[PDB]
Amino acid sequence: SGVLQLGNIVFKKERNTDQASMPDNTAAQKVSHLLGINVTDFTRGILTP
Amino acid sequence: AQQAADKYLYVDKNFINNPLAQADWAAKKLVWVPSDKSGFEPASLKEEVGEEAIVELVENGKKVKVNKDDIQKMNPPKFSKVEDMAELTCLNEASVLHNLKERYYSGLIYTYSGLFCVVINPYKNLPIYSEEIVEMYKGKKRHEMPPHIYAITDTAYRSMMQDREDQSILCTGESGAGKTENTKKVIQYLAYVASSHKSKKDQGELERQLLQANPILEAFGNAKTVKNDNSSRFGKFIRINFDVNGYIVGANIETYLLEKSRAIRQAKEERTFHIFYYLLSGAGEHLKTDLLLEPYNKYRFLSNGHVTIPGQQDKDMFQETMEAMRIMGIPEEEQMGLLRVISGVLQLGNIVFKKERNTDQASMPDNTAAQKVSHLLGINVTDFTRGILTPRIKVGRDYVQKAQTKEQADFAIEALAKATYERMFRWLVLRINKALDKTKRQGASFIGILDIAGFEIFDLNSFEQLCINYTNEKLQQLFNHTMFILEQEEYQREGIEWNFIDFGLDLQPCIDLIEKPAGPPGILALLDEECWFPKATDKSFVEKVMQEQGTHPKFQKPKQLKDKADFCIIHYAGKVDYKADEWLMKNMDPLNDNIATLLHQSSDKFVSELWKDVDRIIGLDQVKGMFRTVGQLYKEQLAKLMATLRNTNPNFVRCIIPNHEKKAGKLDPHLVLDQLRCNGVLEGIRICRQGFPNRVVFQEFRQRYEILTPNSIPKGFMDGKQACVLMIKALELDSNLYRIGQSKVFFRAGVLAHLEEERDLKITDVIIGFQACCRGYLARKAFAKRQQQLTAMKVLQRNCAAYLKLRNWQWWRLFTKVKPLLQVSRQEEEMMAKEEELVKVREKQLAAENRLTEMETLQSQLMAEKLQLQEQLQAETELCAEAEELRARLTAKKQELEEICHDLEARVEEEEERC
Amino acid sequence: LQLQEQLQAETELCAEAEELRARLTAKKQELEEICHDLEARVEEEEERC
Numbered sequence A: 001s002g003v004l005q006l007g008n009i010v011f012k013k014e015r016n017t018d019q020a021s022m023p024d025n026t027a028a029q030k031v032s033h034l035l036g037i038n039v040t041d042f043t044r045g046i047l048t049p
Numbered sequence B: 001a002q003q004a005a006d007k008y009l010y011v012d013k014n015f016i017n018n019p020l021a022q023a024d025w026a027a028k029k030l031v032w033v034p035s036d037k038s039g040f041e042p043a044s045l046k047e048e049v050g051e052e053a054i055v056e057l058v059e060n061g062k063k064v065k066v067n068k069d070d071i072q073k074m075n076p077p078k079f080s081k082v083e084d085m086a087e088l089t090c091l092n093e094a095s096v097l098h099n100l101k102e103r104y105y106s107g108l109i110y111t112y113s114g115l116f117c118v119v120i121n122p123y124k125n126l127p128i129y130s131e132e133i134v135e136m137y138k139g140k141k142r143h144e145m146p147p148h149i150y151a152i153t154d155t156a157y158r159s160m161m162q163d164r165e166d167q168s169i170l171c172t173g174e175s176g177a178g179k180t181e182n183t184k185k186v187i188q189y190l191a192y193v194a195s196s197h198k199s200k201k202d203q204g205e206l207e208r209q210l211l212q213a214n215p216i217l218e219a220f221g222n223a224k225t226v227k228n229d230n231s232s233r234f235g236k237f238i239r240i241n242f243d244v245n246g247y248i249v250g251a252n253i254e255t256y257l258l259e260k261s262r263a264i265r266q267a268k269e270e271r272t273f274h275i276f277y278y279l280l281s282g283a284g285e286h287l288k289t290d291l292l293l294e295p296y297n298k299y300r301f302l303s304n305g306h307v308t309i310p311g312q313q314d315k316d317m318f319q320e321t322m323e324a325m326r327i328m329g330i331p332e333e334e335q336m337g338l339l340r341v342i343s344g345v346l347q348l349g350n351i352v353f354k355k356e357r358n359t360d361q362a363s364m365p366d367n368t369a370a371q372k373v374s375h376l377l378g379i380n381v382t383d384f385t386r387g388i389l390t391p392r393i394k395v396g397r398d399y400v401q402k403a404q405t406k407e408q409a410d411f412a413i414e415a416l417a418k419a420t421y422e423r424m425f426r427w428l429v430l431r432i433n434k435a436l437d438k439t440k441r442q443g444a445s446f447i448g449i450l451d452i453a454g455f456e457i458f459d460l461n462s463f464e465q466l467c468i469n470y471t472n473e474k475l476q477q478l479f480n481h482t483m484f485i486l487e488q489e490e491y492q493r494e495g496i497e498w499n500f501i502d503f504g505l506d507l508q509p510c511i512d513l514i515e516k517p518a519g520p521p522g523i524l525a526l527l528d529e530e531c532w533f534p535k536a537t538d539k540s541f542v543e544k545v546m547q548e549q550g551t552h553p554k555f556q557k558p559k560q561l562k563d564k565a566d567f568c569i570i571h572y573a574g575k576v577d578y579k580a581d582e583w584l585m586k587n588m589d590p591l592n593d594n595i596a597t598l599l600h601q602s603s604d605k606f607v608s609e610l611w612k613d614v615d616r617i618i619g620l621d622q623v624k625g626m627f628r629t630v631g632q633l634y635k636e637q638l639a640k641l642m643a644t645l646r647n648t649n650p651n652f653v654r655c656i657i658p659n660h661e662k663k664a665g666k667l668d669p670h671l672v673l674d675q676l677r678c679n680g681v682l683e684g685i686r687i688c689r690q691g692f693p694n695r696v697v698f699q700e701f702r703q704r705y706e707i708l709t710p711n712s713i714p715k716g717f718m719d720g721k722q723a724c725v726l727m728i729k730a731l732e733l734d735s736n737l738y739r740i741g742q743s744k745v746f747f748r749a750g751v752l753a754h755l756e757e758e759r760d761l762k763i764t765d766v767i768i769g770f771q772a773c774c775r776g777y778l779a780r781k782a783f784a785k786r787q788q789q790l791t792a793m794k795v796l797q798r799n800c801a802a803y804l805k806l807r808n809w810q811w812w813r814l815f816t817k818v819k820p821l822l823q824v825s826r827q828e829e830e831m832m833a834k835e836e837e838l839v840k841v842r843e844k845q846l847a848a849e850n851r852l853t854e855m856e857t858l859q860s861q862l863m864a865e866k867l868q869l870q871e872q873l874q875a876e877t878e879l880c881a882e883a884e885e886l887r888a889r890l891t892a893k894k895q896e897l898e899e900i901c902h903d904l905e906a907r908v909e910e911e912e913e914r915c
Numbered sequence C: 001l002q003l004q005e006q007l008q009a010e011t012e013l014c015a016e017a018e019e020l021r022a023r024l025t026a027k028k029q030e031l032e033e034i035c036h037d038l039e040a041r042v043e044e045e046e047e048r049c
């Protein structure tokens, strides 16, 4: 289920910069719940490693 | 100190509620007006028409004409001693000066200014620093406690843990402002708090060494200048490394711009590095005999003799320096190596050259100074003299040798003294790093702590002060960029309908004047490409700077007389004039290769270690990529620093010297107002009040403050932005207090502090409820114990006592006598003894089996760990053997390349001869 | 503990050997660059004459 919730994650290209934004983290929350992780740490590690 | 706090820390902030404090000012119409008194003026306002005003002076009763643009509103007395100028209603220069001045004269030195703090130097040992860490500033977030360097340090530490982002704490003022002392207090606070939470490893030895690293580098390095009795003379950047728990795993210390020249010359009323004077002042007569120490009056290098500083004895500080070095664990052979090299640098100051009658080439009239040098540094007088007086160089096809005039020999002796002390200091920094950087792997996070040399003003300014002042300029530009530009760029990036505000405060024009390598070449980069020509001379450097940069708006034709070899430049804090005496030699810093290799090849291991990596040293005296100029070295190391700082959250601490007299209590209000203007303090507070200084990511905002609005969010998963919108509507925040970006919630000043207060209230209520349940459950246990202790014995004791009374009285006493006769009781006793001893051996059997099994698993695991360590040891040894093979191959091919290069030069010569 | 300290020693010696080879390769490159410069300029002089 966690692998299914990965890739429901949608990134949007920022309107003024060449950087990823995740304008809705619901799928990332579900992923973090299933995989056993903190949403915010996962979001940082993906968007800006 | 907690009892003293009412004078030195706390304020009756409730006075801000006072209505009459407003109504009295609203009656008096009190205003600020500017003045030439070396004071700033309060007044009441009485006439106006057009642009004109007239005011009555409150202290004088005099009345004077004033301009409408010169009046500044006094905040009503209601605000007096406000802890944070961002909280002021009428923000202006006179109100900030008034608040800082009256807080300082009252003894309160720290004040907040929005996202940064201001400090004014007390020039007293105020009771402000000892007790405060134990309770008062431990974890108490910014609004809980009055402004203090401990609150800054705690705020940075908490932000580092909460935000998972590396911090820096940056102290910025001219000399005597407080950067060094506040840096110490930061390190003391971090050491104390990070050791305190090690509930099984508190008061640890690394936190013991950290407190010593500063006194050592201050004993070396620092000096009594005109402006400061403990002048830095070097910049430093400490990094304290933390684990994921927030405990210290390491520290690192970088150093910059060490003023080598301080060892060789000083102004009329100044001192060398302290350690010279500590060592000469009564260290011990046996040490003096061993180290060949002599009275101060004999050395060239101790200008104007036994200069002293108040309040401290050099004799005691020598011992304290040795104590600190021992706590740092510098072995006594290395400590004595330092003392020997210090004495050797002084003894180079004893060398002199004869002023020869026959021709300009000269020799020493006395070898004894060179003998003392040989006995201290380990380089024999014959090779020392042959090297310095008659150096020989190898250049391609040929060897070249020259004579040395007395000036050239003195310049070689000075260069050796400067470079010897520099190398010793750099080694001592490396030793302290090696002692502190105990973990071979870096921490999960760090806090950087920057302490650059303060802005320098003298009548004698030179290249040293130019580089120091350039560093101060670039740090002030970091402040300006962070507070004004990156702040507003964050609003634009996050889409928050902000309209850009221009504050002025761009220093890139002057920074480019010094540092720019291309386009118009900047002063530092220009001389970097003029020291190489044989026609080069500092007077020509001045003329070329006047041609290439004399048109720059920040450059100035010399203040006093234009005809001398001077630069003059305009900087944020001051306009400064610098003399191009020996800048050719100072920027290139050449060394005699022969004497430098003789120092490397010394019989003394310590001097040979200081002079490791000599191979890079310069090949010629006073006339490219192999060498690097001091200008390039500073620019590169400073760029590495700035690139580090830009990758951290900066916590600025603006340090203000109240007066040039080093006097306690006195302010020069114009000197403070000048510092406030150049530092950008009021612009920094204006951007705090006008902008949205606090930002929280939607998910972090929910996770932290949902406790305030627990029924507002449905229990499912929901987008952080929608959850935040729901929370903020449930918090009923006024729509001007917050804005919602693309990833962050933006809040005005104080709003998020109010939410933190609400959160601490909620968490306190939750803890009180849990304590109530805990204390109830403890009462349940107490009641159960009382129930057992009463109700059983009320029956059991009455029973046993009644039978004790009856059974001895009644014929059952006969059964007591028959029981010793009965054999069955003996057989039961024997069976019980058998069973008991069996049980003892059975317990030992089972325990021994468990112990054997567990220990055998430990033994097996240690066997596996042994095997792994042996395998990696084999890998390392085989890689050493392969590196040795590569070394042999490389050295052979290098010999071939050398011989071919010499054959090519021989061909060039033969071709030119045959032509 | 013996194997640990042996590993510390051999890693220290390996690091020193790597750093020494870095010095050797740097000096070799500088030498070869000056040798190639002299080769090129002697060929230029041979073309001039």
Ligand SMILES: Nc1ncnc2c1ncn2[C@@H]1O[C@H](COP(=O)(O)OP(=O)(O)O)[C@@H](O)[C@H]1O
Residues within 6 Å of the ligand: B121, B122, B123, B124, B125, B126, B173, B174, B175, B176, B177, B178, B179, B180, B181, B182, B228, B229, B230, B231, B232, B454, B655
């Ligand atoms: N916070 C302080 N507490 C006590 N004394 C101070 C404090 N700040 C400065 N001083 C006094 O003023 C001197 C100059 O400040 P210092 O920090 O040494 O200069 P700088 O900021 O240029 O490094 C100190 O050596 C000390 O005597």
Ligand SMILES: [Mg+2]
Residues within 6 Å of the ligand: B176, B179, B180, B230, B231, B232, B233, B452, B453, B454
């Ligand atoms: Mg200082």
